[PDB]
Design an enzyme around this catalytic site. Structure first.
Site, PDB file in Angstrom:
ATOM      1  N   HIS D 202      29.159  -0.764  12.758  1.00  0.00           N
ATOM      2  CA  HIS D 202      30.009  -1.146  13.868  1.00  0.00           C
ATOM      3  C   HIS D 202      30.894   0.009  14.315  1.00  0.00           C
ATOM      4  N   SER D 206      25.124   0.174  17.713  1.00  0.00           N
ATOM      5  CA  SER D 206      23.678   0.323  17.729  1.00  0.00           C
ATOM      6  C   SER D 206      23.258   1.624  18.404  1.00  0.00           C
ATOM      7  N   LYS D 228      17.730 -12.829  24.428  1.00  0.00           N
ATOM      8  CA  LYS D 228      16.568 -12.005  24.117  1.00  0.00           C
ATOM      9  C   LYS D 228      16.087 -12.253  22.681  1.00  0.00           C
ATOM     10  N   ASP D 229      17.019 -12.501  21.749  1.00  0.00           N
ATOM     11  CA  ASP D 229      16.679 -12.828  20.368  1.00  0.00           C
ATOM     12  C   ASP D 229      15.925 -14.160  20.272  1.00  0.00           C
ATOM     13  N   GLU D 272       2.157  -8.848  -5.255  1.00  0.00           N
ATOM     14  CA  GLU D 272       2.122  -9.371  -3.902  1.00  0.00           C
ATOM     15  C   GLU D 272       1.915  -8.226  -2.919  1.00  0.00           C
TER      16      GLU D 272
HETATM   17  C1  HEM Z   1      18.318  -8.541   4.849  1.00  0.00           C
HETATM   18  C2  HEM Z   1      17.862  -7.459   5.481  1.00  0.00           C
HETATM   19  C3  HEM Z   1      18.482  -6.952   6.724  1.00  0.00           C
HETATM   20  C4  HEM Z   1      19.127  -7.590   7.760  1.00  0.00           C
HETATM   21  C5  HEM Z   1      19.438  -9.074   7.952  1.00  0.00           C
HETATM   22  C6  HEM Z   1      19.462  -6.574   8.700  1.00  0.00           C
HETATM   23  C7  HEM Z   1      20.111  -6.846   9.912  1.00  0.00           C
HETATM   24  C8  HEM Z   1      20.380  -5.895  10.885  1.00  0.00           C
HETATM   25  C9  HEM Z   1      20.908  -6.171  12.173  1.00  0.00           C
HETATM   26  C10 HEM Z   1      21.207  -7.563  12.743  1.00  0.00           C
HETATM   27  C11 HEM Z   1      21.063  -4.957  12.797  1.00  0.00           C
HETATM   28  C12 HEM Z   1      21.590  -4.743  14.210  1.00  0.00           C
HETATM   29  C13 HEM Z   1      20.463  -5.130  15.203  1.00  0.00           C
HETATM   30  C14 HEM Z   1      19.178  -4.335  15.002  1.00  0.00           C
HETATM   31  O1  HEM Z   1      19.144  -3.091  15.193  1.00  0.00           O
HETATM   32  O2  HEM Z   1      18.092  -4.855  14.642  1.00  0.00           O
HETATM   33  C15 HEM Z   1      20.666  -3.937  11.891  1.00  0.00           C
HETATM   34  C16 HEM Z   1      20.704  -2.582  12.167  1.00  0.00           C
HETATM   35  C17 HEM Z   1      20.329  -1.638  11.226  1.00  0.00           C
HETATM   36  N1  HEM Z   1      19.798  -1.842  10.012  1.00  0.00           N
HETATM   37 FE1  HEM Z   1      19.401  -3.537   9.226  1.00  0.00          FE
HETATM   38  N2  HEM Z   1      19.061  -5.387   8.254  1.00  0.00           N
HETATM   39  C18 HEM Z   1      18.468  -5.531   7.073  1.00  0.00           C
HETATM   40  C19 HEM Z   1      17.867  -4.579   6.271  1.00  0.00           C
HETATM   41  C20 HEM Z   1      17.911  -3.222   6.527  1.00  0.00           C
HETATM   42  C21 HEM Z   1      17.239  -2.229   5.812  1.00  0.00           C
HETATM   43  C22 HEM Z   1      16.327  -2.466   4.621  1.00  0.00           C
HETATM   44  C23 HEM Z   1      17.596  -1.019   6.405  1.00  0.00           C
HETATM   45  C24 HEM Z   1      17.226   0.366   6.041  1.00  0.00           C
HETATM   46  C25 HEM Z   1      16.431   0.866   5.085  1.00  0.00           C
HETATM   47  C26 HEM Z   1      18.467  -1.275   7.488  1.00  0.00           C
HETATM   48  C27 HEM Z   1      19.042  -0.292   8.263  1.00  0.00           C
HETATM   49  C28 HEM Z   1      19.611  -0.623   9.482  1.00  0.00           C
HETATM   50  C29 HEM Z   1      20.050   0.427  10.398  1.00  0.00           C
HETATM   51  C30 HEM Z   1      19.996   1.930  10.162  1.00  0.00           C
HETATM   52  C31 HEM Z   1      20.500  -0.210  11.493  1.00  0.00           C
HETATM   53  C32 HEM Z   1      21.051   0.423  12.761  1.00  0.00           C
HETATM   54  C33 HEM Z   1      19.840   0.547  13.691  1.00  0.00           C
HETATM   55  C34 HEM Z   1      20.272   0.894  15.100  1.00  0.00           C
HETATM   56  O3  HEM Z   1      20.801   0.075  15.886  1.00  0.00           O
HETATM   57  O4  HEM Z   1      20.055   2.018  15.516  1.00  0.00           O
HETATM   58  N3  HEM Z   1      18.625  -2.624   7.527  1.00  0.00           N
HETATM   59  N4  HEM Z   1      20.245  -4.540  10.731  1.00  0.00           N
HETATM   60  C1  HEM Z   2      15.795 -13.222  -0.002  1.00  0.00           C
HETATM   61  C2  HEM Z   2      15.656 -14.516  -0.303  1.00  0.00           C
HETATM   62  C3  HEM Z   2      14.509 -14.980  -1.116  1.00  0.00           C
HETATM   63  C4  HEM Z   2      13.235 -14.488  -1.291  1.00  0.00           C
HETATM   64  C5  HEM Z   2      12.598 -13.246  -0.679  1.00  0.00           C
HETATM   65  C6  HEM Z   2      12.575 -15.374  -2.189  1.00  0.00           C
HETATM   66  C7  HEM Z   2      11.260 -15.197  -2.642  1.00  0.00           C
HETATM   67  C8  HEM Z   2      10.576 -16.095  -3.445  1.00  0.00           C
HETATM   68  C9  HEM Z   2       9.216 -16.011  -3.810  1.00  0.00           C
HETATM   69  C10 HEM Z   2       8.227 -14.941  -3.379  1.00  0.00           C
HETATM   70  C11 HEM Z   2       8.938 -17.083  -4.597  1.00  0.00           C
HETATM   71  C12 HEM Z   2       7.562 -17.422  -5.146  1.00  0.00           C
HETATM   72  C13 HEM Z   2       7.018 -18.490  -4.150  1.00  0.00           C
HETATM   73  C14 HEM Z   2       5.705 -19.155  -4.522  1.00  0.00           C
HETATM   74  O1  HEM Z   2       4.636 -18.520  -4.456  1.00  0.00           O
HETATM   75  O2  HEM Z   2       5.658 -20.351  -4.902  1.00  0.00           O
HETATM   76  C15 HEM Z   2      10.115 -17.844  -4.744  1.00  0.00           C
HETATM   77  C16 HEM Z   2      10.194 -18.998  -5.503  1.00  0.00           C
HETATM   78  C17 HEM Z   2      11.394 -19.672  -5.631  1.00  0.00           C
HETATM   79  N1  HEM Z   2      12.575 -19.387  -5.051  1.00  0.00           N
HETATM   80 FE1  HEM Z   2      12.943 -17.932  -3.865  1.00  0.00          FE
HETATM   81  N2  HEM Z   2      13.403 -16.360  -2.530  1.00  0.00           N
HETATM   82  C18 HEM Z   2      14.585 -16.177  -1.950  1.00  0.00           C
HETATM   83  C19 HEM Z   2      15.717 -16.974  -2.028  1.00  0.00           C
HETATM   84  C20 HEM Z   2      15.877 -18.045  -2.894  1.00  0.00           C
HETATM   85  C21 HEM Z   2      17.083 -18.740  -3.089  1.00  0.00           C
HETATM   86  C22 HEM Z   2      18.436 -18.476  -2.438  1.00  0.00           C
HETATM   87  C23 HEM Z   2      16.837 -19.723  -3.993  1.00  0.00           C
HETATM   88  C24 HEM Z   2      17.906 -20.630  -4.443  1.00  0.00           C
HETATM   89  C25 HEM Z   2      17.628 -21.051  -5.653  1.00  0.00           C
HETATM   90  C26 HEM Z   2      15.455 -19.626  -4.367  1.00  0.00           C
HETATM   91  C27 HEM Z   2      14.793 -20.467  -5.204  1.00  0.00           C
HETATM   92  C28 HEM Z   2      13.435 -20.334  -5.478  1.00  0.00           C
HETATM   93  C29 HEM Z   2      12.774 -21.275  -6.388  1.00  0.00           C
HETATM   94  C30 HEM Z   2      13.410 -22.471  -7.087  1.00  0.00           C
HETATM   95  C31 HEM Z   2      11.489 -20.872  -6.471  1.00  0.00           C
HETATM   96  C32 HEM Z   2      10.378 -21.466  -7.324  1.00  0.00           C
HETATM   97  C33 HEM Z   2       9.636 -22.653  -6.727  1.00  0.00           C
HETATM   98  C34 HEM Z   2       8.534 -22.085  -5.873  1.00  0.00           C
HETATM   99  O3  HEM Z   2       7.663 -21.270  -6.251  1.00  0.00           O
HETATM  100  O4  HEM Z   2       8.499 -22.411  -4.695  1.00  0.00           O
HETATM  101  N3  HEM Z   2      14.911 -18.590  -3.662  1.00  0.00           N
HETATM  102  N4  HEM Z   2      11.106 -17.203  -4.035  1.00  0.00           N
HETATM  103  C1  LIG Z   3      27.599 -11.465  12.106  1.00  0.00           C
HETATM  104  C2  LIG Z   3      28.152 -12.872  11.943  1.00  0.00           C
HETATM  105  C3  LIG Z   3      29.498 -13.075  12.642  1.00  0.00           C
HETATM  106  C4  LIG Z   3      30.664 -13.042  11.662  1.00  0.00           C
HETATM  107  C5  LIG Z   3      31.390 -11.702  11.752  1.00  0.00           C
HETATM  108  C6  LIG Z   3      30.908 -10.792  10.645  1.00  0.00           C
HETATM  109  C7  LIG Z   3      32.028 -10.732   9.627  1.00  0.00           C
HETATM  110  C8  LIG Z   3      32.435  -9.281   9.519  1.00  0.00           C
HETATM  111  C9  LIG Z   3      33.788  -9.129  10.177  1.00  0.00           C
HETATM  112  C10 LIG Z   3      34.742  -8.444   9.212  1.00  0.00           C
HETATM  113  C11 LIG Z   3      34.671  -6.933   9.355  1.00  0.00           C
HETATM  114  C12 LIG Z   3      35.842  -6.441  10.179  1.00  0.00           C
HETATM  115  O1  LIG Z   3      35.313  -6.304  11.488  1.00  0.00           O
HETATM  116  C13 LIG Z   3      36.143  -5.552  12.345  1.00  0.00           C
HETATM  117  O2  LIG Z   3      36.897  -6.479  13.116  1.00  0.00           O
HETATM  118  C14 LIG Z   3      37.673  -5.941  14.189  1.00  0.00           C
HETATM  119  C15 LIG Z   3      38.298  -7.147  14.872  1.00  0.00           C
HETATM  120  O3  LIG Z   3      37.679  -8.370  14.426  1.00  0.00           O
HETATM  121  C16 LIG Z   3      36.795  -5.082  15.120  1.00  0.00           C
HETATM  122  O4  LIG Z   3      37.616  -4.414  16.074  1.00  0.00           O
HETATM  123  C17 LIG Z   3      37.046  -4.298  17.388  1.00  0.00           C
HETATM  124  O5  LIG Z   3      37.338  -5.442  18.186  1.00  0.00           O
HETATM  125  C18 LIG Z   3      38.704  -5.707  18.560  1.00  0.00           C
HETATM  126  C19 LIG Z   3      38.656  -6.786  19.647  1.00  0.00           C
HETATM  127  O6  LIG Z   3      37.438  -7.552  19.558  1.00  0.00           O
HETATM  128  C20 LIG Z   3      39.505  -4.460  19.000  1.00  0.00           C
HETATM  129  O7  LIG Z   3      40.886  -4.661  18.689  1.00  0.00           O
HETATM  130  C21 LIG Z   3      39.090  -3.148  18.315  1.00  0.00           C
HETATM  131  O8  LIG Z   3      39.539  -2.048  19.112  1.00  0.00           O
HETATM  132  C22 LIG Z   3      37.585  -3.029  18.045  1.00  0.00           C
HETATM  133  O9  LIG Z   3      37.290  -1.944  17.162  1.00  0.00           O
HETATM  134  C23 LIG Z   3      36.030  -4.036  14.297  1.00  0.00           C
HETATM  135  O10 LIG Z   3      35.184  -3.236  15.128  1.00  0.00           O
HETATM  136  C24 LIG Z   3      35.210  -4.720  13.213  1.00  0.00           C
HETATM  137  O11 LIG Z   3      34.613  -3.762  12.344  1.00  0.00           O
END
Ligand code: HEM
Ligand code: HEM
Ligand SMILES: CCCCCCCCCCCCO[C@@H]1O[C@H](CO)[C@@H](O[C@H]2O[C@H](CO)[C@@H](O)[C@H](O)[C@H]2O)[C@H](O)[C@H]1O
Ligand SMILES: CCCCCCCCCCCCCCCCCC(=O)OC[C@H](COP(=O)([O-])OCC(O)COP(=O)([O-])OC[C@@H](COC(=O)CCCCCCCCCCCCCCCCC)OC(=O)CCCCCCCCCCCCCCCCC)OC(=O)CCCCCCCCCCCCCCCCC
Ligand SMILES: CCCCCCCCCCCCCCCCCC(=O)OC[C@H](COP(=O)([O-])OCC[N+](C)(C)C)OC(=O)CCCCCCCCCCCCCCCCC
Ligand SMILES: CCCCCCCCCCCCCCCCCC(=O)OC[C@H](COP(=O)([O-])OCC[N+](C)(C)C)OC(=O)CCCCCCCCCCCCCCCCC
Ligand SMILES: CCCCCCCCCCCCCCCCCCCC(=O)O[C@H](COC(=O)CCCCCCCCCCCCCC)COP(=O)(O)OCCN
Ligand SMILES: CCCCCCCCCCCCCCCCCCCC(=O)O[C@H](COC(=O)CCCCCCCCCCCCCC)COP(=O)(O)OCCN
Ligand code: HEC
Ligand SMILES: CCCCCCCCCCCCO[C@@H]1O[C@H](CO)[C@@H](O[C@H]2O[C@H](CO)[C@@H](O)[C@H](O)[C@H]2O)[C@H](O)[C@H]1O
Lengths: 124, 244, 54, 383, 63, 71, 85
Positions: D202, D206, D228-229, D272
């Site tokens: 932030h 982006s 768009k999302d 996997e």
């Molecule tokens: C749970 C996994 C993740 C979530 C939910 C997540 C979510 C996001 C979101 C919502 C953004 C801003 C929108 C976008 O550019 O798509 C973002 C940006 C970014 N993420 Fe992730 N991310 C994840 C994993 C990762 C991983 C594995 C990497 C790197 C190895 C990464 C690196 C970045 C970077 C560098 C940006 C900035 C990209 C840009 O706007 O230029 N994130 N991520």
């Molecule tokens: C990043 C989030 C997660 C990933 C990538 C993930 C991934 C997986 C995978 C690959 C399996 C094996 C599925 C199958 O072939 O049956 C599995 C099983 C399971 N996961 Fe997760 N998991 C996640 C989050 C969670 C969370 C938050 C819970 C809360 C308990 C959970 C509970 C389970 C349980 C109980 C199973 C075994 C039953 C089954 O195989 O379906 N997982 N998970």
């Molecule tokens: C993604 C799900 C939505 C939930 C929000 C995610 C939780 C993370 C928030 C906590 C991190 C602190 O986040 C921080 O907040 C302040 C104000 O809120 C932001 O501050 C920004 O916005 C405010 C007004 O909107 C301005 O006063 C400021 O000049 C600007 O930088 C920071 O840019 C951000 O980094």
């Protein structure tokens, strides 16, 4: 890489007759396929700006150059989001692709690198 | 690896359930249950299936209750704490032929017949593998194949030597619906039944999927319209620049 | 169009009420329509089709 | 002042989802971030629900999963959704990382979000590995055995560490129960790191597909990127629907429908699909410890992209040679994936070694050289 | 090109009936339909999903 | 009788004749090789699994749909 | 490197006039057919080589390797397999 290094290496190549004979034609083709001119950019518009040095160089641009750069960035952003290319006068012609920023960043970097050297001077 | 080590890959047969919109043929499921009960159940368990699972799939409530009530299950101990048996109920699981692995292996020359409840999901090929295996015992092994003792040649089985002999022969079952019980017919029916046993949600799942596909597709189309509508002021933006 | 807009769309309270009522109707009618369609394309195959024999 | 700005809690949400100033030209590859958030929400909802019906004890685990499939209302759906979404999570994460590498999202001033991102990726791997074990089928057990035995390569203490991780002398009940507890936990840790990388982002905002500043031309996150999302959300849900309802076992291994048996070894023990490239890298090095180091290094080497990319320009949109090199790098990564699941046989052994060398040489040799040369071509070419 | 009072050409995009109620109503029909399917989809999802917590088939069998 | 018997025979004599013939030729050779003495003390004992697979794969391609049509 | 609305960190802007029209006033799908055919064709043509070259190379490599592997594990490939191991 610093702009300084890029400019110095390029000058070594341009000096060498053989080197320039091979590199200049390749560089010109590269720039044609790069296609930044098709979004109305000049080459220097693409340089990463989020560094202290580059922020300083941008602040030193003459106001006109600065205003024109802003417009080129906004225009290119609009082409990008529309998935369109520039046409007509929006296309940057080779003669318009001037290195407006290079002199400013070279001066900023010259001072920055001199400062680093002089921070390491040893009284003999 | 050699093709032999992998096993021959089964043909893709046109199952009634193949097809995004297709259920199982329930008449085939019922016939396949009968093949299970009269042939496979001598050696193979179906431990994950309860009598209640057949109801409204292959059998009525009464038919399934009759199957359960013919068997004896372990009851809770009596008042002196002595063991007792009771007749089966719909809640009971279909009982297996053997008390344990050791008894199973002793009856099958060392080989252990797997439980068949998941076998359609536990093998590459599914129904096609089951059908191909049951119908794929050649009269004679290919010249040069040396079978280990108690092994039978079957090209679909990895390595070729399987501890299960051919069991389906024309007319080993007499179907109750009059269908001619050929090797092929019985193999098809039992493969269908076992596919159902592995995935009993199949029919419902695919119907819910149809509903989801339709709703999600419509929402995708509408989301495109709405995105384009909202974005048009940005897309349509025009500039006039007058250098200061 | 004006009338329709004024009654069902102009007030968000009314718009949301209309959307929710329509969702209720959709949900019930879609269910019935899919059920019938599913039964026709899978005719003769389902338990309900063979149940009568037993 | 508007409440959304005045109230500190509302203002935090506001700053991320509503007033957040975005570049006006983000393309569809910027949609993977929200898809990853969607996968995470689905995994939390389905996972917590599975945990209400699952039993972690080795005598009951496999049977509790069958109980979910057969007896629990919509248990089949919740199970298949959870299993398939794990795969979709990796598709989205590879796409997201691919976007980041192509567009130079790792460059200053975004080194910190990228570096936290690398940790998110490691946490996802550990999460998914442990979840797979919970089924306690044949692939569960044997995958756990082989993967946990890699720790034996740690010098001096490795064997002791393995027994410590297992809670015994082989993978068994103690291992399963601890994997359940940690599998539950790890997604919460992952959510925290996901939030951290966004907070780090932030400060710069982006990046965008042109690689230039967007400070000149910003668009509110809402409504533009919200709507768009939604398009990609519904495209994702269509893909989800096709797998979960029509082909729920396409991405899985049939051997995981056989209960774990420490005696019988499955024909082939593979991870996997989403771990396959790293498995191919491990196989390429003959030494045990060498292999483990290479496998870990294959992920940790992402941390040096900010250093080895010598370009004065952010991202590949305008760099023909860097685009070709990127294409070869990606296809090589896919070939490594394929080689992770072939048998250890000629000629795949040598091919795996060549592909491993190419993987590392992208970071260590090719990207530094190509980026240096392109700098010179931009300068000379535009003179 | 120079005068900022000469609006750029928007004729390729402009609707003639932009001020009419019919025009607005159409776009709200699309928005409304999307909201309708989202409500129906959420309801279906919530109902099917949460039913996991109601007595499972094995529990109902023993009742 | 089993419809498969006839369908399989027809497919072997017809569209899969080349493969049938390879299998046959292989069998002849292997049986003859087994007949010869000091076969048991040979390094390499040829089988006909490969040829059998090619034949069966071919029969299956020409029969699968036809068979299920008459069940 | 990023501020907020009102102080985003842009260099001073002057001399640009921006114009647009209401979403209700515009046809959202204006020129969709032209874009879907001609724009997509242009966009795809200019990027085709960057996909085709690596995909075709790595697919060729895979094809050769998988065919060799298959051949090595036949009867005919016995001798070559013995050397390869
Ligand atoms: C749970 C996994 C993740 C979530 C939910 C997540 C979510 C996001 C979101 C919502 C953004 C801003 C929108 C976008 O550019 O798509 C973002 C940006 C970014 N993420 Fe992730 N991310 C994840 C994993 C990762 C991983 C594995 C990497 C790197 C190895 C990464 C690196 C970045 C970077 C560098 C940006 C900035 C990209 C840009 O706007 O230029 N994130 N991520
Ligand atoms: C990043 C989030 C997660 C990933 C990538 C993930 C991934 C997986 C995978 C690959 C399996 C094996 C599925 C199958 O072939 O049956 C599995 C099983 C399971 N996961 Fe997760 N998991 C996640 C989050 C969670 C969370 C938050 C819970 C809360 C308990 C959970 C509970 C389970 C349980 C109980 C199973 C075994 C039953 C089954 O195989 O379906 N997982 N998970
Ligand atoms: C993604 C799900 C939505 C939930 C929000 C995610 C939780 C993370 C928030 C906590 C991190 C602190 O986040 C921080 O907040 C302040 C104000 O809120 C932001 O501050 C920004 O916005 C405010 C007004 O909107 C301005 O006063 C400021 O000049 C600007 O930088 C920071 O840019 C951000 O980094
Ligand atoms: C998983 C979950 C499902 C959700 C789906 C999300 C996927 C969305 C996404 O990011 O990709 C869509 C995405 C469309 O995104 P976009 O925002 O219109 O364009 C991004 C680029 O500008 C596109 O680059 P461009 O403008 O240069 O257009 C080139 C591209 C796209 O061409 C188009 O016209 C589109 O053409 C190609 O497909 C490449 C040539 C290959 C030929 C063989 O498609 C591609 O870019 C595919 C090219 C990738 C290689
Ligand atoms: C397979 C090989 C892919 C090579 C891509 C080369 C560029 C191209 O044609 O893409 C189209 C577009 C070109 O977009 P662009 O932004 O460069 O160009 C837009 C148009 N101009 C030039 C006029 C401004 O590239 C992308 O959109 C690339 C995103 C990369 C995502 C890769 C995911 C792989 C996952 C593996 C993880 C490890
Ligand atoms: C996930 C569940 C989705 C629930 C949506 C149910 C109906 C709400 C709806 O469609 O919102 C339309 C409404 C109105 O959409 P609008 O904001 O485009 O309409 C405002 C202008 N009038 C009232 C003249 C039409 O949006 C909301 O009220 C926000 C709630 C959506 C979440
Ligand atoms: C968790 C995984 C999320 C993905 C959901 C996709 C489909 C799951 C829904 C269950 C299902 O099978 O519903 C079908 C219809 O699908 C649909 O119509 C659902 C698709 C809708 C897509 C997403 C819309 C919102 C869903 C998420 C919001 C949940 C919380 C918000 C309050 C048919 O089931 P049925 O119609 O027989 O059901 C009884 C009511 N008649
Ligand atoms: C999933 C189901 C879709 C979303 C449900 C909302 C129904 C949509 C109809 C409502 C609608 O269009 O009104 C807007 C509500 O949208 C909103 O307020 C939300 C806009 C879109 C929501 C999605 C945001 C990103 C989705 C990606 C997932 C993120 C990852 C986390 C899992 C108002 O808004 P307006 O400003 O256009 O008003 C215009 C004047 N009142
Ligand atoms: C009297 C014994 C016996 C009968 C009858 C029998 N089986 Fe088997 N079956 C076995 C044995 C023993 C194995 C284990 C073979 C092995 O692993 O070598 C087996 C294995 C199988 C396998 C798994 C092969 C594999 O890939 O591991 C399937 C599927 C199978 N049987 C199905 C059936 C069906 C369907 C029927 C009858 C309609 C049937 N069996 C009848 C003894 C029998
Ligand atoms: C704030 C939200 C309010 C509380 C949410 C309420 C939670 C529980 C509501 C009902 C869940 C059970 O409600 C029940 O749902 C299932 C589907 O899920 C329906 O069941 C219907 O569809 C399923 C498959 O979709 C079929 O197997 C079944 O034969 C059919 O009757 C029942 O007709 C309904 O009675």
């Amino acid at each position: 890489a610093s702009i300084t290094s890029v400019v110095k290496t390029s000058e070594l190549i341009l000096k060498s007759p053989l080197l320039s004979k091979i590199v200049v034609p390749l560089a010109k083709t590269y720039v044609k396929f790069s296609g930044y001119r098709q979004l109305g950019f000049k080459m220097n518009d693409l340089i990463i700006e989020e560094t202290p040095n580059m922020q300083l160089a941008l602040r030193r641009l003459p106001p006109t150059e600065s205003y024109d750069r802003v417009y080129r960035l906004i225009r290119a952003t609009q082409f990008s989001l529309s998935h369109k290319l520039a046409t007509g006068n929006d296309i940057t012609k080779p003669e318009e692709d001037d290195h407006y920023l290079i002199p400013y960043i070279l001066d900023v970097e010259a001072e920055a690198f001199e400062k680093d050297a002089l921070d390491n001077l040893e009284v003999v | 690896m050699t093709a032999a080590e992998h096993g021959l890959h089964p043909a893709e047969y046109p199952w009634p359930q193949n097809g995004m919109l297709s259920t199982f043929d329930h008449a085939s499921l019922r016939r396949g249950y009968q093949v299970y009960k009269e042939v496979c159940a001598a050696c193979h368990s179906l431990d994950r299936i309860a009598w209640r699972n057949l109801v409204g799939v292959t059998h009525t409530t009464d038919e399934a209750k009759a199957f359960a009530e013919e068997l004896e299950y372990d009851d809770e101990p009596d008042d002196e704490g002595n063991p007792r048996k009771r007749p089966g109920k719909l809640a009971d699981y279909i009982p297996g032929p053997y008390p344990n692995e050791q008894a199973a292996r002793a009856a099958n020359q060392g080989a252990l017949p797997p439980d068949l409840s998941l076998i359609a999901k536990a093998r590459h090929g599914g129904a096609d593998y089951i059908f191909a295996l049951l119908t794929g015992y050649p009269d004679e092994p290919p010249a040069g194949v040396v079978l280990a003792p108690g092994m039978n040649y079957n090209p679909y089985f990895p390595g070729g030597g399987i501890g299960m002999a051919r069991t389906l022969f024309d007319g080993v079952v007499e179907y109750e619906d009059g269908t001619p019980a050929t090797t092929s017919q019985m193999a098809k029916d039992v493969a269908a039944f076992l596919t159902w046993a592995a995935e009993p949600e199949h029919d419902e799942r695919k119907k819910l999927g149809l509903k989801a596909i339709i709703v999600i597709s419509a929402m995708l189309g509408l989301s495109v319209y709405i995105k384009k509508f909202k974005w048009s002021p940005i897309k349509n933006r025009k500039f006039i620049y007058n250098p200061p | 169009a004006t009338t329709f807009y004024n009654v069902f769309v102009k007030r968000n309270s009314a718009f949301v009420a209309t959307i929710l009522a329509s969702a209720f109707v959709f949900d019930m009618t879609f269910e019935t329509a899919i059920d019938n369609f599913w039964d026709r394309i899978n005719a003769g195959k389902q338990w309900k089709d063979i149940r009568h024999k037993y | 002042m508007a409440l959304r700005k005045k109230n500190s809690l509302l203002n935090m949400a506001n700053s991320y989802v509503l007033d957040s100033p975005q570049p006006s030209n983000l393309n569809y590859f910027w949609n993977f971030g929200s898809l990853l958030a969607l996968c995470l929400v689905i995994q939390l909802a389905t996972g917590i629900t599975l945990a209400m019906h699952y039993t972690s004890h080795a005598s009951l685990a496999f049977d509790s999963v069958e109980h979910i499939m057969r007896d629990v209302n919509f248990g089949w759906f919740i199970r298949y959704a959870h299993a398939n979404t794990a795969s979709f999570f990796f598709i989205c994460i590879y796409a997201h990382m691919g976007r980041n590498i192509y567009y130079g999202s790792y460059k200053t001033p975004r080194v910190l979000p990228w570096s936290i991102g690398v940790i998110i990726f490691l946490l996802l791997i550990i999460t998914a590995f442990m979840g797979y074990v919970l089924v306690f089928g044949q692939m569960s057990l044997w995958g756990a055995t082989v993967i946990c035995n890699l720790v034996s390569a740690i010098p001096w203490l490795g064997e002791d560490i393995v027994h410590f991780l297992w809670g015994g002398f082989s993978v068994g009940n103690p291992t399963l129960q601890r994997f359940f507890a940690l599998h539950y936990l790890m997604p919460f840790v992952l959510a925290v790191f996901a939030l951290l990388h966004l907070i780090a982002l932030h400060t710069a905002g982006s990046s965008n597909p042109l690689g230039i500043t967007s400070n000149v031309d910003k668009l509110s996150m809402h409504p533009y990127y919200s709507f768009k999302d939604l398009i990609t959300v519904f495209a994702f849900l269509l893909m989800f629907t096709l797998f979960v309802f029509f082909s729920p076992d396409k991405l899985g291994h049939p051997d995981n429908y056989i209960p774990a048996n420490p005696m019988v070894t499955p024909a082939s023990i593979v991870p996997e699909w989403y771990l396959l490239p790293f498995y191919a890298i491990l196989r390429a090095i003959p030494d045990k410890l060498g292999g483990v180091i290479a496998m870990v290094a294959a992920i940790l080497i992402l941390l040096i992209l900010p250093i080895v990319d010598r370009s004065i320009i952010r991202g590949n949109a305008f760099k023909p040679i860097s685009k070709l090199l990127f294409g070869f790098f990606i296809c090589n990564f896919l070939l490594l994936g394929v080689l992770g699941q072939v048998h250890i046989e000629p000629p795949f052994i040598v091919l795996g070694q060549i592909c491993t060398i190419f993987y590392f040489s992208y970071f260590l040799i090719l990207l530094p050289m190509v980026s240096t040369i392109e700098n010179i071509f931009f300068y000379i070419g535009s003179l | 090109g120079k005068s900022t009072y000469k609006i750029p050409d928007f004729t390729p995009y402009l609707k003639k009936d932009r001020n009419t109620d019919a025009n607005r109503l159409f776009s709200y029909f699309m928005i409304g339909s999307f909201g309708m399917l989202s409500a129906a989809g959420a309801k279906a999802t919530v109902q099917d999903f949460l039913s996991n917590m109601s007595a499972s088939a094995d529990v109902l069998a023993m009742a | 009788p089993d419809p498969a018997i006839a369908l399989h025979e027809a497919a072997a004599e017809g569209p899969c004749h080349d493969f049938k013939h390879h299998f046959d030729e292989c069998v002849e050779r292997v049986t003859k090789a087994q007949e010869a003495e000091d076969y048991d003390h040979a390094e390499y004992k040829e089988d006909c699994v490969e040829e059998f697979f090619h034949l069966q794969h071919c029969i299956n391609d020409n029969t699968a749909d036809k068979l299920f049509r008459v069940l | 490197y990023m501020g907020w609305w009102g102080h985003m960190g842009s260099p001073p802007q002057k001399g640009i006039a921006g114009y647009t029209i209401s979403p209700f006033a515009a046809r959202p799908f204006a020129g969709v057919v032209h874009a879907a055919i001609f724009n997509t064709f242009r966009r795809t043509k200019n990027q085709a080589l960057f996909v085709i070259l690596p995909v075709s190379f790595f697919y060729y490599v895979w094809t050769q390797a998988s065919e060799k592997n298959e051949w090595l594990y036949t009867k005919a490939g016995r001798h070559e397999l013995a050397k390869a191991l």
